[PDB]
Structure formats: C-alpha cells, structure tokens
Design a protein around this ligand. Structure first.
Ligand SMILES: NS(=O)(=O)c1ccc(NC(=O)CN2C(=O)NC3(CCCC3)C2=O)cc1
Ligand SMILES: NS(=O)(=O)c1ccc(NC(=O)CN2C(=O)NC3(CCCC3)C2=O)cc1
Ligand SMILES: [Zn+2]
Length: 259
C-alpha cells in the first residue's frame, strides 16, 4: 500500500523507488526563472468561471486537506490561456511549511513562499478524473502563492473548520464555500507542462501559476500547521512541510501571459 509522505524516511527523495516517473521528463514543481520565461502572444485569455461552484466536503487525507466540489456537471470551470477545451474544478488544497520562509512547491527566482494553493481541474473531454490523469492534457492546476501579511477574509471559513479535521481520515461538511475569495486581483500567470506533485506523480498537468500572491495572516497559516499527518489516537506528527522541492526543468519552456 501507499506509505509515501514528507518525512526523512518516506519523503520526496524516496518516492522514485515506488514511482519511477519521479525522475521523468516533465515533473513538477519547478523553479520559475522570471528573466528566462517569455511572453507568449499565442496564449488566449484565461477564464476562471467559479460563479456556480458547489463545494461539498473538506477531508484531511494525511498529506493535506482537500476542499471537494460537485464535479458531476460544469459548475466551476477553467478555460482559455494555454488550455484547449473545458476543465472542471474537482478540489483545492494547499502545501505549506513549518516556517513562513518555506512551504511553496513552485519557486520564483528560487524564492519560496509560505504556502501554495492548488485548484485542481480535469479535462471534461476524458469524462472522469481517473481517465483524465492518464492523458498528457488531462488536468489543469491553477497555482496561487501565499505570503504572510494581512488576513485573507475568503480563507477564514477554511481555517475555522480545520479544528474538526485535525487527523488523517477525518472529513466535515463544507458546503456553500466560494473559492473566488482565494484569488488575487491579477490573473497574470506562467504556464508549463508538468505533473502531479505527489505520488503517483503522473505527467498529466498543464500548470498555470499566478504571478500575484495572496496575503494570509500569520494566525491563518499557524492554524494550517496545527493539522496532523497521523490518524486519531496516534502519536502527533504536525502536518507541516508537505511540499515537494523544485524538479529539473529538462526540455521545457515556461511561458508568461504578460508582457
Ligand atoms: N518509495 S516511497 O513510496 O516513498 C516509500 C517509502 C517508505 C516506505 N516504507 C516506510 O519506511 C514507511 N513506512 C513504514 O515503514 N511504516 C509506516 C509507518 C506506519 C505505517 C507504515 C511507514 O510510513 C514505503 C514506501
Ligand atoms: N499537488 S497537485 O499536483 O495539485 C495534485 C493534485 C491531485 C492529486 N491527486 C488526486 O487528486 C488523487 N486522486 C485520484 O487519483 N483519484 C481521486 C479520488 C477519486 C477522484 C480523485 C484522487 O483524489 C495529487 C496531486
Ligand atoms: Zn498540490
């Protein structure tokens, strides 16, 4: 069974033994060299359409927490930019650090942010998420950096439910949450072809990483760091540093949406 994690004995440097694609040609995350990334005029306007998003549940899966959506219809979709066709929102989650100076998966000129939000979408031409992850253009993940400063009001409903999902396998109702409250003002982005950043590390993702970080308060991210990797009644292992470091760019170009 899956025994991967983020510790010294099961962390990113071990994953390749059970998931050899860990050393593949389009792995994520990567460092975004802002000087090398080139403006691409072929990129179409990005369309984030979350007006009808229907959140259902929040789950501690032992690696992060997922806010899950009803993806049984096109209620919340991502289109445009580098994408051909329609990608349906299925879940979002975060990666974060033990300290404000680390936590993001992508880096910007080697800068690590305190955390990174991943809004995960699947290409509806493949019918279901399980089929989509077997395709090179199966998923689109919208990545948003978090820095510590002023509170993000749209995050507080997430922060306040974390006490109820402290341990692995716990879930709670999480209806009527509007993910539009987690976006920054600008949709300027970088894009490149990559992978899931956790096992099974499938090379099925078009990454769209927003340039503008959101600000969250120290108090908000400190509540992320009170979650547990362990299950109920097990020795406490704080859920911190659940990020994979930058992987080799190999034969890839990062494109910028902005001049
Ligand atoms: N290539 S990999 O997927 O990263 C990878 C890395 C390590 C391991 N095996 C491990 O050492 C980790 N493992 C244990 O030995 N015992 C537990 C703790 C209690 C439940 C199971 C655990 O987590 C398996 C796969
Ligand atoms: N950090 S990341 O790259 O954004 C990223 C995003 C997603 C994932 N993995 C998944 O969503 C894993 N997974 C499946 O394969 N099947 C389900 C259960 C049934 C449908 C969805 C599931 O949860 C891993 C990393
Ligand atoms: Zn992620």
């Amino acid at each position: 069974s899956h025994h991967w994690g983020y510790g010294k004995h099961n962390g990113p440097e071990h994953w390749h033994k059970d998931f050899p694609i860990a050393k593949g040609e389009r792995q994520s995350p990567v460092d975004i060299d802002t000087h090398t990334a080139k403006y691409d005029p072929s990129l179409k306007p990005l369309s984030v359409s979350y007006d009808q998003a229907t959140s259902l549940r929040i789950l501690n899966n032992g690696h992060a927490f997922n806010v899950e959506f009803d993806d049984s219809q096109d209620k919340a979709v991502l289109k445009g930019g580098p994408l051909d066709g329609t990608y349906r929102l299925i879940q979002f989650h975060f990666h974060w650090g033990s300290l404000d100076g680390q936590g993001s998966e992508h880096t910007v000129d080697k800068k690590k942010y305190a955390a990174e939000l991943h809004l995960v979408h699947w290409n509806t031409k493949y019918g279901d998420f399980g089929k989509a992850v077997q395709q090179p253009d199966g998923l689109a993940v919208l990545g948003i950096f978090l820095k510590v400063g002023s509170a993000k009001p749209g995050l507080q409903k997430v922060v306040d439910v974390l006490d109820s999902i402290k341990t692995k396998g716990k879930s709670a109702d999480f209806t009527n949450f509007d993910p539009r409250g987690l976006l920054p003002e600008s949709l300027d982005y970088w894009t490149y072809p990559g992978s899931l950043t956790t096992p099974p590390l499938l090379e099925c993702v078009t990454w769209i990483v927003l340039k503008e970080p959101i600000s969250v308060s120290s108090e908000q991210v400190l509540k992320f760091r009170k979650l547990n990797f362990n299950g109920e009644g097990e020795p406490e292992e704080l859920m911190v540093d659940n990020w994979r470091p930058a992987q080799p760019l190999k034969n890839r170009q990062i494109k910028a949406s902005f001049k």
